[PDB]
Design a protein around this ligand. Structure first.
Ligand SMILES: N#Cc1ccc(NC(=O)Nc2ncccc2OCc2ccccc2)c(O)c1
Ligand SMILES: Nc1cccc2c1CN([C@H]1CCC(=O)NC1=O)C2=O
Ligand SMILES: [Zn+2]
Lengths: 376, 1124
C-alpha cells in the first residue's frame, strides 16, 4: 500500500465535517434486564468493539437519536434470525461516540458513529407510537475463565508460573507449554490438549494464519487482550449471518478464538450467495486497507449499511456505470457497481485510484450479505 | 437425580503444607500437616510422631503459619482458606478435652482484584507486628496483629511491581521489611520495601538487585546474625544483604528445579532443599562473623516433596502430593561416608487419583477399588479393601489340614499349650512353648484316625472324637480312661461335643453320650428320616455346660430340626432352601440374644432366631458369604462371643445394636480356624488353608487395607479384565535424549521390567520424551505379566476391556494420538485391538483415524469412540475388523464420553454438554439436548436416564437434568441446572461402584487430585427435605474452626460468581450429628418432621435421627480415629 493512509477508512470522512465526540462509560450490569431503543432500518449483526456508521433522515429516527444523545446514547442492534419476520433472539448494544445534525436547506439529517459494547438476549420486543421499537433485553456476561491449571497447580510450582518474556519462536512455545501445563500430570489429560484451550496460544495461531494470508499485517494490528482480539477477528471474518450469530452467542474468548480458527482452516473460497455458481475471490486476495481490518461497516447515502471486504482481485463480476468519487468510503478511489455475471446480483464495487502514485491502483469492495463462505 | 447425597469415603491424603512449632504447649515440639480441608497435629517424639488432634475446616487451607505474639505463652496458628477465610487459632487442652479456639477471624477478599499467578502468599513478620497477604496483582494486604483486631481488619498498600514471584519478611531490620522477586519487561529482579507503620505505606527498602537469574523463583529470609535473603533459581543460588552479594552455580543442582526449602537450625547455617524429582540437598552458609560462601550437598533421594520440615534428631518430614509422605533420617556417618538420607517411616498418599476401577462389584463379597495413583517414580496402583485385618505372628508349612483344636495339657495352667490338627486318616499334635512349636505325641490320643473333635472336658479329662471311636483321656495320668464304640462298630459320620455331653451321628442313627469321671455313658439312641449332615450341642444360656437342644441337618431333604436333650424329640423343623445340602450348624448367643446359624455347600448362610425354652425360628434370613461351603467356629472377642466363617471369603459375624454384622476378613482363603490363647500367642487364633498353618491376632477394628503396587512410572488409565484375571494399565515413562541416536530411561520401571514384552515397531540434547505403554498386570500377584510399547510420539489416551459383536473373546482396546510439537491439533491416531493370551499380548486389529481418540466406551456390543470433534460408532465384524457404522459431527471436542442404554453423554473441557441418542432403525445418532456454559470441566457421569453429574472449575459438582416439564422441542433440548455444590476437591474420575462399601439409591464413586475418595448417591425428595432442614439446624450447633459458615463453604464458587448450593446434602455434615451431646441432638430435631412411610409426618425424636444417620454411615467406608 502506497499513498493510502489506512486510517482514513475508519474516520468515515464521507459522513461530513468534524462531528462532536462523546466519551461514554455506560455499561449495564451482567444478567441485568434493560429496555433499549431499536432503530427500525438497521439490519446488520453488530459485534462488540465494531464501529457502526449511520445516516438518519426519518423525523422519528432523528428525534430518538437526539433524545438518546442526552442520557446513555445507547441503542440496540438486533441480530435478525429472520429478516422478513423481524425475528431476533440476540443482539448487541451500540453506544454513539460521534454525532452531527444537518439542518441545511431545512432538511434534517442525523449522522452518527457508534461502537458495539454489550451482547444481550431479546426478552421482549415492543413497537412504540413513534414507530421506534423498544426491546426488553437481558445483558449476556462476558465469561472470563481462569487458567486451566489454576485449580490443579501445585503451590510449589506456583513460583515458576510466571516465565521470561518471548523474544514467537517455536522453542519458546514448547517451553511455555511444558511450564504452564506441568500440573496436567495431576489430571486425566495431556498438556497439548490444554494448549488447544489456551487463549495466548490460540491468538498466536490466528496471528500466524492471518500473517500468511496478509503478510502486510507486519505490525501488531490485533489487540493484545483475548476478548478484544476475538471480537476484532469476528467482526472482520467474511462469513454467513447464521455463523456470525453463532459467534455472537459465544460468551467465552477461548470458545470464540477456537471457532474463528476452525472457520479460518475450513473456509478457502467466497462465492455469490444468490447463484452459488460463481467464485468471486479467495482468502489470499483478502487484505486490510483499514486499521480495523479487511471488512468494516460503511453507510451509503440512503442510510443503508454494508459490511465491505477489501480484496486485491475479484473474478466473474461485470462492471456497470461510470467510476464515481461521490460518497466514496475509501478517499482517493472511485467506485463502479459490480454484478455477478451469472445472476446479476450486486456483490459490491470495484475501487479505482484517482491518482497514478496511489497503491493499490485497483481493489474490490465486496458486501458480506452478497457473499457465501465455501468450504472446498 | 435432582436430590443427591455426597459423602467422603477416604479423606484427602496428599500434603499441601507442613510447619513446626509449639502450638500444643510451650514445651512440646509440634508437626502441623495440612491436607486440603484437614489439619493434623502431632507431637514430635524421639520415637517419631504422636497424633494428638485432627480437625476439619470448612475451607481449602492455603496458608498455615505458626507465630508467637508478645505476651503469648505458646504459638498461635494463622490459617487462610482459598475462599479468603482468615483466622487465628489457639490450642486449648483441659485434662483430656482438646478444643481449637478461634481468637480472631474474618474474610479478607477484596471485592475486585486479579488473583496473582503465583497464587496466595501469606507471611508474618519476625516481630509478629503484622500478617502480609499477597492475594492480588498490585496490592499487599496488611492485617495488624494488635489484640483489638479480632475481625482481622486489614489495609492494602499499592505495589508498583505487578508480577511478584515470591516475597518474605526480612530479619534483623528496624521496621518490618519485605523482600521479593518480580518480573517486568526488563527482566527478573529482587527488591525490598519497608512498611511504614504510621503511614500504612511502603518506604524505600534497604537494598535491591536487578537482573537476577531469569528463573529466580524462591526467596528465603536468613535470620540473625547474618540477615539478608537467599534467592534460588534454576541454575544458581545467590545471597543478598545491604552491601553483600554471593553467587554459586554448583553442577550438583543442574538437573532439576529446586521447589521447596526448610531451615534446619535457628541461626540459618543450614537449609534443606528439594527438587521436583526427589533429590534432597543441604544448603550451607559458610562463615568467616561474616558470610563468606554458599555450599550445596546432595543428601540422597526422597519422595517428590511439596513441603520439607526438619523436626529433631536428624529426622525430616517429607510432605508429598505426587507420592507417599515420609519420615527420613539424616545419617551421622558424614565424616567417613558423606551425608546420606535413610527412610524410617512411609505414610500412604493415594493422590493424584487419575483413574480407578472397581472389582467384585456384587455385594455378596465386598468390592475392591484399584486406583492409578501418583506420578513419575511415585506412580503406583493402590488396591483398597475394607475388612478385618489379622496380624500374622507365625507360619507353619503343614499341607492337608482338615481340622484345628486348641487344648490345655496342664490342668493347672489356664493357657492353651497344645494345638491338634486333623489330616485325612491321620491326627497330629503340636506343642506350644512360647513362640516355639514342636510336634509331639499325646498319650491316649490315636494318630491313625482323622479327628472330628478334640477338646478339654469336665472332670479334668481330655476327649478325642474319631470316626472309629470316642476316646476319654485323663490329664494328670495322661492315659485313656474310657472309649465308646458303635454297637456294630460302624464309623461315626458326624460328631458334636461340649464339656459335659457328646452327641454323635452314624448314618441316620444319632447317639447321645454324657461325660462322667473316668466314664462315658450312652444316655439316648435315635433314628432320623434323612442322613445327618451337621450337629451342634453348644450350651447356650445358663447351665453346667449342659444343652437341652441338639441341632441337626438332614441330607436327603435339607432341614434344621432342633431336638430335646435327653428327650431326642424334635421341637421344631426349619425351612428347606433347596437341593444344596447343609454343611455346618451352629447355635450361638450374641449379647443376650440367641440365634441358630446354618451353613450350606452352595455357601449360603441361613440364620434363624431360637428361644432356649421353645427353640423355634424367629426370622429366616439368608446371607451369601462365599461360593465355597462355610464352616462356623465360635471365638471370644473381648467379653462378647463372635463366629468366624471359614470359606473362600472368611467372614466375622458381629452383633452391634442387637443386629447381625457380616464383616470381611482381609485374608485370601481359610478352610479351618480355632481360637488360640497360649502364653506366646494370647487371645490369638490359628488359621489353615490347603498348605499352611498361621497363628495370628485380629486387628479388633475394621480398617481400609491398601496394597501398594509401585510402578516407578506414571499410571494413567486402568481397566479390569475378569476372564483374564488381570488389569490393563496404560502408562508412560520419561526418557532422555541419548548421545547414541536414541533415548534412555531414567530408571527401571514397570514398562521396562515386564515378564514378557512387545513393541509396535522396530524403529531406531537432554530433551525428555514420553514413552507410552500398555501394562498387563496380574490381579493376584500384581506381577507385570506383559508390557506393550506404542509408536514413537504416539500418545495413548483411552482404554477399554470388552467383548464386541458376536466374538466371544474379550479384548483390550486402546485409542491413541500422534503428537508432534509443531502440530497443535492431532491429525493422526489409531484404535488398537489387543488380545491377552499365552502370557502374550497380540495385536488382533488396528484402525487408523485422522485425529486423537480421546475417549471410548463399549456401546451395545459395538465400540463408540470420540475422535477430535466427532463421535463414531464401530461394528466388530467376523473378519476381526472395526467397521464404521455412523459418525456424528459436533461443534465440540468429545473429551468426555458416557453411555446408558441407547443414550450418549458427550462433554468438553469448557463444560459444553451434548446428549445423543442412537437411532437403531436409522443407523445414526440423534441430538436430544445440549447445554453450553463456559467453565473448566474435569469429569462427567450419568446418574440415571435424565440426570448427569459433572465436576467443574473451583472444585464444584453440578447436576443437570433433561426436564420433563416441557412440551416445546426447544424446552426438551435444554438441560436444567438442578444441582450445584462446592466439593473442595478436583475430580478426575467418576465410576459406578454399587454396594462396594456396603434411604439412598445408586452409587457413584469419584477419585481426586488430593487422594480423597467420595460417594454420590440419590435421595427421594422427602429425604432431601428432611436432610436439608437438619443441616440448617446442625449448622447452628456445630463449632466451626475459624467460624466459617457451612453455607458459605459449600456455596458454588468461581472467581466470577458465587451461588448457594442446591440439590446436594453434605453427608460429612449429616454424620457429625452422631457426635453432639444428647441435649444438642434434641434441639437439632426440635420442630423437625419425620416423614415415615405413611405420609403423615410426626415430630422427630433424637432416637429417630440417630438410627437414620447411623444407617447413612454404613453406605461408605468408616474414617480411622486419628489420635490414640
Ligand atoms: N486488526 C485486524 C484484523 C482482523 C481480522 C483479519 N482477518 C480476518 O479476519 N480474516 C482474513 N484475513 C486475511 C485473509 C483472509 C482472511 O479470512 C479467511 C476467511 C476467508 C473466507 C471465509 C472465512 C475466513 C485481519 O487480517 C486483520
Ligand atoms: N449513490 C448511491 C445510491 C444508492 C446506493 C449507493 C450509492 C453509493 N453507494 C456506495 C458506493 C461505494 C462507496 O464507496 N460508497 C457508497 O456510499 C451506495 O451504496
Ligand atoms: Zn450470482
Amino acid at each position: 500500500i502506497i499513498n493510502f493512509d489506512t486510517s482514513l477508512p475508519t474516520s468515515h470522512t464521507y459522513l461530513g465535517a468534524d462531528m462532536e465526540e462523546f466519551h461514554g462509560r455506560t455499561l449495564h450490569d451482567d444478567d441485568s434486564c434493560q429496555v433499549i431503543p431499536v432503530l427500525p432500518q438497521v439490519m446488520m449483526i453488530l459485534i462488540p468493539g465494531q464501529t457502526l456508521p449511520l445516516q438518519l433522515f426519518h423525523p422519528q429516527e432523528v428525534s430518538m437519536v437526539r433524545n438518546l444523545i442526552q442520557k446513555d446514547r445507547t441503542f440496540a442492534v438486533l441480530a435478525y434470525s429472520n429478516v422478513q419476520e423481524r425475528e431476533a433472539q440476540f443482539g448487541t448494544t451500540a453506544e454513539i461516540y460521534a454525532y452531527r445534525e444537518e439542518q441545511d436547506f431545512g432538511i434534517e439529517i442525523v449522522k452518527v458513529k457508534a461502537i458495539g459494547r454489550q451482547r444481550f438476549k431479546v426478552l421482549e420486543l415492543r413497537t412504540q407510537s413513534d414507530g421506534i421499537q423498544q426491546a426488553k433485553v437481558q445483558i449476556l456476561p462476558e465469561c472470563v475463565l481462569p487458567s486451566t491449571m489454576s485449580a490443579v497447580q501445585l503451590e510449589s510450582l506456583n513460583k515458576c508460573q510466571i516465565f521470561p518474556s518471548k523474544p514467537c519462536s517455536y522453542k519458546w512455545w514448547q517451553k511455555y507449554q511444558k511450564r504452564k501445563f506441568h500440573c496436567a500430570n495431576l489430571t486425566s489429560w495431556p498438556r497439548w490438549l490444554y494448549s488447544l484451550y489456551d487463549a495466548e496460544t490460540l491468538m498466536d495461531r490466528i496471528k500466524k494464519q492471518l500473517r500468511e494470508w496478509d503478510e502486510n499485517l507486519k505490525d501488531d494490528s490485533l489487540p493484545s487482550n483475548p476478548i478484544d482480539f476475538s471480537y476484532r477477528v469476528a467482526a472482520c471474518l467474511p462469513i454467513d449471518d447464521v455463523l456470525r450469530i453463532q459467534l455472537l452467542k459465544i460468551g467465552s474468548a477461548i470458545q470464540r478464538l477456537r471457532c474463528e480458527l476452525d472457520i479460518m482452516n475450513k473456509c478457502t473460497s467466497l462465492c455469490c450467495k444468490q447463484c452459488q455458481e460463481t467464485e468471486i475471490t479467495t482468502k489470499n486476495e483478502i487484505f486490510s486497507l483499514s486499521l480495523c481490518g479487511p471488512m468494516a461497516a460503511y453507510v451509503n447515502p440512503h442510510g443503508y449499511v454494508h459490511e465491505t471486504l477489501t480484496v486485491y482481485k475479484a473474478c466473474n463480476l461485470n462492471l456497470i456505470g461510470r467510476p464515481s468519487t461521490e460518497h466514496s468510503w475509501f478517499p482517493g478511489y472511485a467506485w463502479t457497481v459490480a454484478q455477478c455475471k451469472i445472476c446479476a446480483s450486486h456483490i459490491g464495487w470495484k475501487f479505482t485510484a484517482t491518482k497514478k502514485d496511489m497503491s493499490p491502483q485497483k481493489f474490490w469492495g465486496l458486501t458480506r450479505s452478497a457473499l457465501l463462505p465455501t468450504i472446498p | 437425580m435432582s436430590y443427591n447425597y455426597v459423602v467422603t469415603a477416604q479423606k484427602p491424603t496428599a500434603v499441601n503444607g507442613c510447619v513446626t512449632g509449639h502450638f500444643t504447649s510451650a514445651e512440646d515440639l509440634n508437626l502441623l500437616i495440612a491436607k486440603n480441608t484437614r489439619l493434623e497435629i502431632y507431637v514430635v517424639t524421639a520415637e517419631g510422631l504422636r497424633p494428638v488432634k485432627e480437625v476439619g475446616m470448612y475451607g481449602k487451607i492455603a496458608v498455615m503459619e505458626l507465630f508467637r505474639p508478645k505476651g503469648e505463652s505458646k504459638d498461635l496458628l494463622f490459617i487462610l482458606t482459598a475462599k479468603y477465610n482468615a483466622c487465628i487459632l489457639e490450642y486449648k487442652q483441659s485434662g483430656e478435652s482438646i478444643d481449637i479456639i478461634t481468637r480472631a477471624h474474618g474474610n479478607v477478599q477484596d471485592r475486585i482484584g486479579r488473583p496473582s499467578e503465583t497464587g496466595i502468599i501469606g507471611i508474618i513478620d519476625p516481630e509478629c507486628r503484622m500478617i502480609g497477604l499477597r492475594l492480588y496483582d498490585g496490592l499487599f494486604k496488611v492485617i495488624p496483629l494488635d489484640r483489638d483486631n479480632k475481625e482481622l481488619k486489614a489495609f492494602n498498600i499499592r505495589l508498583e511491581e505487578l508480577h511478584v514471584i515470591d516475597v518474605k519478611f526480612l530479619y534483623g531490620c528496624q521496621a518490618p521489611t519485605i523482600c521479593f522477586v518480580y518480573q517486568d519487561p526488563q527482566g527478573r529482579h529482587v527488591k525490598t520495601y519497608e512498611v511504614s507503620l504510621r503511614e500504612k505505606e511502603f518506604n524505600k527498602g534497604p537494598w535491591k538487585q536487578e537482573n537476577v537469574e531469569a528463573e529466580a523463583s524462591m526467596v528465603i529470609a536468613v535470620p540473625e546474625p547474618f540477615g539478608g535473603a537467599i534467592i534460588i533459581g534454576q541454575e544458581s543460588i545467590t545471597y543478598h544483604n545491604g552491601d553483600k552479594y554471593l553467587a554459586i552455580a554448583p553442577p550438583i543442582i543442574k538437573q532439576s528445579t529446586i521447589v521447596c526449602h526448610n531451615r534446619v537450625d535457628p541461626n540459618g547455617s543450614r537449609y534443606l532443599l528439594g527438587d521436583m524429582e526427589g533429590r534432597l540437598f543441604m544448603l550451607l552458609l559458610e562463615k568467616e562473623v561474616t558470610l563468606k560462601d554458599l555450599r550445596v550437598e546432595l543428601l540422597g533421594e526422597t519422595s517428590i516433596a511439596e513441603c520439607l520440615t526438619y523436626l529433631d534428631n536428624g529426622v525430616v518430614f517429607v510432605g508429598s502430593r505426587l507420592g507417599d509422605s515420609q519420615l527420613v533420617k539424616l545419617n551421622v556417618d558424614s565424616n567417613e561416608q558423606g551425608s546420606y538420607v535413610v527412610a524410617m517411616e512411609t505414610f500412604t498418599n493415594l493422590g493424584p487419583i487419575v483413574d480407578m476401577c472397581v472389582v467384585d462389584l456384587e455385594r455378596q463379597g465386598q468390592g475392591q477399588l484399584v486406583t492409578c495413583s501418583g506420578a513419575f517414580k511415585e506412580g503406583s496402583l493402590r488396591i483398597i479393601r475394607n475388612g478385618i485385618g489379622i496380624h500374622e505372628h507365625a507360619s507353619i508349612d503343614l499341607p492337608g489340614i482338615k481340622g484345628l483344636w486348641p487344648l490345655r495339657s496342664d490342668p493347672n495352667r489356664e493357657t492353651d499349650d497344645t494345638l491338634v490338627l486333623s489330616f485325612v486318616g491321620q491326627t497330629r499334635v503340636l506343642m506350644l512353648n512360647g513362640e516355639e512349636v514342636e510336634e509331639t505325641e499325646l498319650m491316649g490320643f490315636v494318630d491313625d484316625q482323622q479327628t472330628f473333635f478334640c477338646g478339654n472336658v469336665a472332670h479334668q479329662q481330655l476327649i478325642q472324637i474319631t470316626s472309629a471311636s470316642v476316646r476319654l483321656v485323663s490329664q494328670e495320668p495322661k492315659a485313656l480312661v474310657s472309649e465308646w464304640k458303635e454297637p456294630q462298630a460302624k464309623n461315626i459320620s458326624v460328631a458334636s461335643c461340649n464339656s459335659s455331653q457328646v452327641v454323635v451321628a452314624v448314618g441316620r442313627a444319632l447317639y447321645y453320650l454324657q461325660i462322667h469321671p473316668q466314664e462315658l455313658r450312652q444316655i439316648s439312641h435315635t433314628e432320623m428320616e434323612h442322613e445327618v449332615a451337621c450337629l451342634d450341642i453348644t450350651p447356650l444360656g445358663d447351665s453346667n455346660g449342659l444343652s437341652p437342644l441338639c441341632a441337626i441337618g438332614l441330607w436327603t431333604d435339607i432341614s434344621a430340626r432342633i431336638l430335646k436333650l435327653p428327650s431326642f424329640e424334635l421341637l421344631h423343623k426349619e425351612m428347606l432352601g433347596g437341593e444344596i445340602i447343609p454343611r455346618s450348624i451352629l447355635m450361638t448367643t450374641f449379647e443376650s440374644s440367641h440365634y441358630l446359624l446354618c451353613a450350606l455347600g452352595d455357601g449360603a448362610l441361613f440364620y434363624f432366631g431360637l428361644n432356649i425354652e421353645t427353640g423355634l425360628l424367629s426370622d429366616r434370613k439368608k446371607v451369601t458369604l462365599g461360593t465355597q461351603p462355610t464352616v462356623l467356629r465360635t471365638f471370644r472377642s473381648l467379653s462378647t462371643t463372635n463366629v468366624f466363617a471359614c470359606s473362600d471369603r472368611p467372614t466375622v459375624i458381629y452383633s452391634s445394636n442387637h443386629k447381625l454384622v457380616f464383616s470381611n476378613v482381609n485374608l485370601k482363603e481359610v478352610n479351618y480356624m480355632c481360637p488360640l490363647n497360649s502364653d506366646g500367642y494370647p487371645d490369638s487364633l490359628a488359621l489353615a488353608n490347603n498348605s499352611t498353618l498361621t497363628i495370628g491376632t485380629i486387628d479388633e477394628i475394621q480398617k481400609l487395607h491398601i496394597r501398594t503396587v509401585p510402578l516407578y512410572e506414571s499410571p494413567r488409565k486402568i481397566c479390569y479384565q475378569e476372564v483374564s484375571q488381570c488389569f490393563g494399565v496404560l502408562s508412560s515413562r520419561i526418557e532422555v535424549q541419548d548421545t547414541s541416536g536414541g533415548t534412555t530411561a531414567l530408571r527401571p520401571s514397570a514398562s521396562t521390567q515386564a515378564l514378557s514384552s512387545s513393541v509396535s515397531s522396530s524403529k531406531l540434547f537432554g530433551e525428555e520424551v514420553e514413552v507410552h505403554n500398555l501394562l498387563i498386570i496380574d490381579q493376584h500377584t500384581f506381577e507385570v505379566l506383559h508390557a506393550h510399547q506404542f509408536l514413537q510420539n504416539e500418545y495413548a489416551l483411552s482404554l477399554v476391556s470388552c467383548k464386541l459383536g458376536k466374538d466371544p473373546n474379550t479384548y483390550f482396546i486402546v485409542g491413541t494420538a500422534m503428537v508432534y510439537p509443531e502440530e497443535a491439533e492431532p491429525k493422526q491416531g489409531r484404535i488398537v485391538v489387543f488380545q491377552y493370551s499365552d502370557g502374550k499380548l497380540q495385536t488382533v486389529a488396528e484402525k487408523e483415524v485422522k485425529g486423537a481418540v480421546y475417549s471410548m466406551v463399549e456401546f451395545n456390543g459395538k465400540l463408540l469412540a470420540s475422535i477430535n470433534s466427532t463421535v463414531r460408532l464401530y461394528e466388530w465384524t467376523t473378519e476381526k475388523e472395526l467397521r464404521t457404522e455412523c459418525n456424528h459431527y459436533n461443534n465440540i471436542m468429545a473429551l468426555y464420553l458416557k453411555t446408558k442404554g441407547d443414550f450418549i453423554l458427550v462433554g468438553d473441557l469448557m463444560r459444553s454438554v451434548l446428549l445423543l441418542a442412537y437411532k437403531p432403525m436409522e443407523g445414526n445418532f440423534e441430538e436430544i439436548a445440549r447445554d453450553f456454559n463456559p467453565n473448566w470441566m474435569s469429569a462427567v457421569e450419568i446418574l440415571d436416564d435424565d440426570n448427569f453429574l459433572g465436576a467443574e472449575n473451583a472444585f464444584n459438582l453440578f447436576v443437570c437434568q433433561k426436564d420433563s416439564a416441557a412440551t416445546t422441542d426447544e424446552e426438551r433440548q435444554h438441560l436444567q441446572e438442578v444441582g450445584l455444590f462446592h466439593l473442595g476437591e478436583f475430580v478426575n474420575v467418576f465410576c459406578h461402584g454399587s454396594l462396594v462399601m456396603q434411604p439412598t439409591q445408586g452409587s457413584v464413586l469419584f477419585g481426586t487430585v488430593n487422594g480423597m475418595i467420595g460417594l454420590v448417591t440419590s435421595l427421594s425428595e422427602s429425604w432431601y427435605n428432611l436432610l436439608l432442614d437438619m443441616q440448617n439446624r446442625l449448622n447452628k450447633v456445630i463449632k466451626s474452626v475459624g467460624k466459617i459458615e457451612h453455607s458459605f463453604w459449600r456455596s458454588f464458587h468461581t472467581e466470577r460468581k458465587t451461588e448457594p448450593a442446591t440439590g446436594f446434602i453434605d453427608g460429612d455434615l449429616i454424620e457429625s450429628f452422631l457426635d453432639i451431646s444428647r441435649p444438642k441432638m434434641q434441639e437439632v430435631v426440635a420442630n423437625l418432621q419425620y416423614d415415615d412411610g405413611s405420609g403423615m409426618k410426626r415430630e422427630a425424636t433424637a432416637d429417630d435421627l440417630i438410627k437414620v444417620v447411623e444407617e447413612l454411615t454404613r453406605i461408605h467406608w468408616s474414617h480411622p480415629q486419628f489420635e490414640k
